[PDB]
Amino acid sequence: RFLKVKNWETDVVLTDTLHLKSTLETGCTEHICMGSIVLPVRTKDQLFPLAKEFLDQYYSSIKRFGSKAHMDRLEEVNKEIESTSTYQLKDTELIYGAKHAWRNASRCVGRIQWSKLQVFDARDCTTAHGMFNYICNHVKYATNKGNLRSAITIFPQRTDGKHDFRVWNSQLIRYAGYKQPDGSTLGDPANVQFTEICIQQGWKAPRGRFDVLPLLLQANGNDPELFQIPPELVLEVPIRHPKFDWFKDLGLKWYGLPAVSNMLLEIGGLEFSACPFSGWYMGTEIGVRNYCDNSRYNILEEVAKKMDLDMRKTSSLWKDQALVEINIAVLYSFQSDKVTIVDHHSATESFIKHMENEYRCRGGCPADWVWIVPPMSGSITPVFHQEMLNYRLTPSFEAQPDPWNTHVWKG
Amino acid sequence: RFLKVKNWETDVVLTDTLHLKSTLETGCTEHICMGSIVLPTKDQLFPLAKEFLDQYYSSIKRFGSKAHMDRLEEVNKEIESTSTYQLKDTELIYGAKHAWRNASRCVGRIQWSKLQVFDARDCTTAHGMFNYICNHVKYATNKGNLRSAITIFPQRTDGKHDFRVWNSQLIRYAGYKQPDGSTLGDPANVQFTEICIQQGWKAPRGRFDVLPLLLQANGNDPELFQIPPELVLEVPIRHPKFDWFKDLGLKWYGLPAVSNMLLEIGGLEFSACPFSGWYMGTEIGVRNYCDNSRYNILEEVAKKMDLDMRKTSSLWKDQALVEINIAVLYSFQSDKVTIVDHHSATESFIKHMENEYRCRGGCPADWVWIVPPMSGSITPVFHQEMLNYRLTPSFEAQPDPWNTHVW
Ligand code: HEM
Ligand code: HEM
Ligand SMILES: Cc1cc(N)nc(C[C@@H]2CNC[C@@H]2OCCNCCc2cccc(F)c2)c1
Ligand SMILES: Cc1cc(N)nc(C[C@@H]2CNC[C@@H]2OCCNCCc2cccc(F)c2)c1
Ligand SMILES: C[C@H](O)[C@H](O)[C@H]1CNc2nc(N)[nH]c(=O)c2N1
Ligand SMILES: C[C@H](O)[C@H](O)[C@H]1CNc2nc(N)[nH]c(=O)c2N1
Known part of the structure; x- marks a missing residue:
């Protein structure tokens, strides 16, 4: 057929x-x-x-x-x-x-x-230390000083199914989330839970807006162990704008290596x-989602403020306006630092x-x-107008339940 | 379950x-x-x-x-x-x-x-259909306050006595194939404009020519009618900041009226x-103005803004797209024609x-x-799982009458 x-x-x-x-x-x-x-288990x-x-x-x-x-x-x-x-x-x-x-x-x-x-x-890996070493080498090879591989x-x-190897982190490099008693979150709201598990495991939290989480690694179905990625291995880019000089004072940065670890x-x-x-990022992952989701760093307000857009009516398209400038900024910053990135048109x-x-x-x-279809400017990218059939082939990458939900604690 | x-x-x-x-x-x-x-x-x-x-x-x-x-x-x-x-x-x-x-x-x-x-x-003829339609257009428009x-x-x-309106909307702009290689007006309606001209429509051969209705009564041969021009509320397109925008010659009609279903x-x-009903802003600004296969005005607008079109990564498409949509919303608001933006919608x-x-x-x-064709993830619908399924009563798409009708 x-x-x-x-x-x-x-x-x-x-x-x-x-x-x-x-x-x-x-x-x-x-x-x-x-x-x-x-x-x-099969x-x-x-x-x-x-x-x-x-x-x-x-x-x-x-x-x-x-x-x-x-x-x-x-x-x-x-x-x-x-x-x-x-x-x-x-x-x-x-x-x-x-x-x-x-x-x-x-x-x-x-x-x-x-x-x-x-x-x-x-x-050939047998321990959580073994894994750390493998993961550091991976981070280092892949990063390649900005020329990502x-x-x-x-x-x-x-x-x-009782001796699983798992990486408790959802990405190898991700920033800490910190829920405050006032109800506000410090850092990345998506990582609050996992950040709690790290603290609870003995991690000394710096409690800043951009603290790189520790690796939390399970080997051979044992309880997971904490490790810290060498800071020299963590490539980050501070975000600035080409025309907007106040942009840098917003204090934003982001890591260069997107590394999915939970599949x-x-x-x-x-x-x-x-x-x-x-691999490497497409700019919108950071600039649309990571920065501008309400449940993430949610900077749209603060950025439209600086730009002095009309914020009394959604119909001023103020959010859309700020959105674009932030995404301009992400792309501009990575390119200036020679960290591989791709915009959503080209991708x-x-x-x-x-x-x-x-x-x-x-x-x-x-x-x-x-x-x-990218989370901004959808119809002006060619994928919008493209019918697609979606179906599962193997080999395949699947989602799996988070391991704190399933793990049987040895102690 | x-x-x-x-x-x-x-x-x-x-x-x-x-x-x-x-x-x-x-x-x-x-x-x-x-x-x-x-x-x-x-x-x-x-x-x-x-x-x-x-x-x-x-x-x-x-x-x-x-x-x-x-x-x-x-x-x-x-x-x-x-x-x-x-x-x-x-x-x-x-x-x-x-x-x-x-x-x-x-x-x-x-x-x-x-x-x-x-x-x-109780309608029986195409003229009957024309009266009923003009009456719908006028009621629904309501001097700008759409209903x-x-x-x-x-x-x-x-099934051999079908009533049909051959237009896909009651109000659309004509599409003409030019000796230039390019297209005049709305490329999405070339086929239909040809058909109208075939049936005997004097085309003004301009950019925002309002199409004639083609009405099929009782499975008969469709006839041509012009909507009274004074019933078609149209909006000239200007921008609250950009003085020059208006000189693009852009206009849009206030009443979206789906007629092929x-x-x-x-x-x-x-x-x-x-x-x-009435338009959500992105319908005109993002789709009608910006689609390669439509009025395709991104290139032209980007130039008047003087953005770096050298490379995709400057986001010049994105920049111009926003302001195009600011203009659409602002213009409809200024003329007091109901429109809704994609956030509020x-x-x-x-x-x-x-x-x-x-x-x-x-x-x-x-x-x-x-999900709006622009800024998806900053709209709440993006983050909402939905289930799609077909309930009845329903609106359904159906084959274009010209592929089917026999004269
Ligand atoms: C060249 C670098 C790559 C780019 C620019 C890229 C781009 C993307 C983007 C933008 C997404 C969805 C973004 C999101 O919402 O998280 C995605 C999803 C995904 N990518 Fe890629 N990717 C790249 C490399 C890879 C690699 C190296 C793999 C593994 C071999 C991979 C496997 C996947 C999988 C399995 C998904 C679905 C994610 C999920 O279900 O959460 N990608 N990719
Ligand atoms: C009054 C405010 C209304 C708004 C803001 C609105 C909005 C929209 C939008 C954005 C679409 C997407 C289709 C496209 O982008 O081409 C759509 C499709 C549709 N709407 Fe509504 N609409 C309104 C009134 C109505 C009314 C009065 C009806 C029916 C009586 C209706 C029924 C439909 C149907 C059947 C579709 C799918 C058409 C297709 O498959 O091409 N809408 N509408
Ligand atoms: C609940 C749930 C299910 C699922 N399958 N997936 C998730 C990850 C979410 C999806 N959206 C935000 C977050 O994803 C963050 C991770 N996305 C990176 C994809 C990527 C890009 C470039 C290079 C790469 F190697 C990989 C959550
Ligand atoms: C082939 C085909 C199938 C289909 N279902 N549909 C089409 C019309 C195209 C699709 N997408 C844009 C354009 O349709 C034209 C715009 N649609 C109007 C929806 C609407 C909005 C507000 C008020 C209303 F009363 C109605 C073509
Ligand atoms: C291929 C895809 O189904 C097609 O581009 C759709 C996507 N979503 C759309 N959404 C709306 N509202 N209108 C459209 O015309 C389309 N086009
Ligand atoms: C409900 C919906 O499927 C969900 O929000 C999806 C929409 N599209 C997405 N697309 C990407 N690339 N990443 C996402 O997390 C999502 N989220």
Whole structure:
């Protein structure tokens, strides 16, 4: 069967055949669309099929589908599974899986880059100190003094689900949140809870607006340990504006490395519950969301004040006006410091080209419109006018319950 | 079976139950989500009729009463005997309003209950249709103080006697293909302008030429009419700061009046049913003025502002886009034509979801269309999970009449 997506700006119509390789469910039914819902331990029995599907895909990709090497490897895996009930991926298969998980990440506008991922194999890691060292090396490699390189570090897979490796932080580098008795928050409101768990674990909180959280790391299902990232490894950019000289006095800065640490990498039915990855930012993540969400640093008011916009009527578009200048500032600051960043116009155009190529070479590109369209200026970016089909391929990056909610404390 | 919607900004969680009463099919499956796709008999009619009359008598707190039972029989006897049935005025008023209430793509639904309904089921000709439409335009416009309204022409019979308004809105601007290679006026209406000129319209061949109506009565051949110009309230576009803006020659019409949709009440189909409310500012400024395929004025405006167009990252598109929308809002306000901005529109809709969840058990909403095409995440709708599903009565898209009609 065939499915067609149209672009309403260009009239270019594409045909998706790839969605036929999608078994996982979406949340949607014929009666209900759940496209805007954010969140819509395995037997031998169910494992070998997932391994088989994965290794036929790997083997196809390297042009060895049906070979001896292929067959011997299905045999090898079959056996390991029957014997130990799990299996180990070869290096080449890990690399290929992590890549394809990114490539299948339908909420990711940054996929043109999918083939260039640096993979760090951390499957020999046994302790939370081991993890810290791996994570520092990752932060350092990826940061590359501002010339950011995408990377993922991959720690041991789930076994019995009682010995999980996890990174309690939701990103490797994130700023502390601090709820005050007056009810106001100091720093980043999104990190209040995790900030509490850190303090409670023994972290001495500086209690500033931009305190870099400590890494909180679980190995082998043990209680997580605290570590501090070397400050020299944390690239930050102070935010200033090109025309507006008062902007710097607002006191804003941001870290340069976006590094998602709370997702689960599924490859060949195996579950990699610590797999922190990173690329570089698109400017709007910081300037629209991080700075201007009501439940984040919420600086829109303070910025429109300085600009002396008319704030007595929403219809002065004062918020929209401040929004743009802040985003100008983020982009200006990173560029002046030579820290890789991409604006939303350029990122969305690149994504359109990626997507079309993917249709040609692969027979499709799953894409989640709700997330692909940037949180500002949506319709003046080409992704707005692009129909997209959203569906789950493996390998894949999934959300997973936060570990403070599940962890069984040893003490 | 009981679904939860979360707001990620306020942590408010609502529980939807209205969706189990959903009847039409969405486009999505267990395997594939089509949320972002624009267009995803006697025995047939009686359950549809019943389903509808059941909800109606439930709305007037008379469910199961004799008045209810009597109607259900009357309609049954009419279907069996005539192949169709006729709605009571009260059922018609209720259906129209409820179709609006159910429009999952409409951010404006807090207003749903004040729909003025014009019963045009007694219309027989295209001239009749023209009178009714001019009357709708004038009532709804109201010297600038716009009032939501819909006019309903006779329902489909054997499907070869359809009433249609060929325009996609009652008031739109002509599209002309130029020897230059470019387009004059509104590129979205080239096809339709050709058709009008084919039927014999003297086109002024300007930029903001108000289209002629093409009215199909009783499945006949459509005829041309000009809306009296004094009925079409238009707004010249200026900016509170920028002196030069006005010299772009921009204007827009006050009354958005969707006229190509099909209204389904209780299995009966009303294929000509233009309705109008009023504009949310982003509709004109962001979409009509700025879309590559529309009036596409970003380039021109950026130059008058003298911003660095050398590179995307200066956000010059974004800068000009804002001020274009300031101008639209300011201009409508200065002329006292109702318009609403996207902040206020979305805020109002969040209030309207809460009331609907509290009062009806839910609210079908299509996030893709609800979120303004500019500044999404600073509007509250961005952070609101919504569930999209199809309830009836409904407004539905339908094929352009020219693809279908035979002369
Ligand atoms: C070139 C650098 C990249 C850019 C500019 C980029 C851009 C983005 C953006 C803007 C989002 C959504 C933003 C948000 O709301 O959080 C996103 C989501 C995502 N990205 Fe990328 N990304 C990049 C690299 C990567 C890498 C290296 C991976 C992993 C290999 C990745 C995997 C994902 C996943 C799994 C999501 C969904 C996130 C979630 O569900 O919370 N991205 N990306
Ligand atoms: C009075 C203030 C109103 C506001 C502010 C408003 C706002 C909107 C907006 C922004 C859209 C998005 C569609 C687009 O951007 O093209 C929309 C769509 C829609 N509205 Fe409303 N509207 C209003 C009145 C009405 C009325 C009176 C009706 C029906 C009687 C209605 C029914 C619909 C329907 C059916 C759609 C979807 C049309 C389509 O699929 O193209 N609205 N509305
Ligand atoms: C509840 C929930 C579910 C889910 N899947 N995800 C979340 C993370 C939220 C989404 N929106 C804000 C925050 O996301 C913050 C992390 N976003 C970074 C994506 C990115 C960009 C560039 C390079 C990269 F390597 C990665 C929360
Ligand atoms: C192909 C196709 C399908 C569809 N459902 N719709 C279209 C009209 C396009 C879509 N999106 C913009 C334009 O529609 C024109 C603007 N729509 C007006 C909605 C509205 C607003 C305020 C008051 C009202 F009474 C009505 C085309
Ligand atoms: C409810 C809604 O799906 C939610 O707010 C989404 C909308 N789109 C988004 N898009 C991105 N990139 N990141 C987000 O966190 C969200 N939030
Ligand atoms: C592809 C996508 O469905 C299409 O661009 C939609 C997105 N959201 C929209 N939302 C509204 N209100 N109006 C539109 O015309 C569109 N276009």
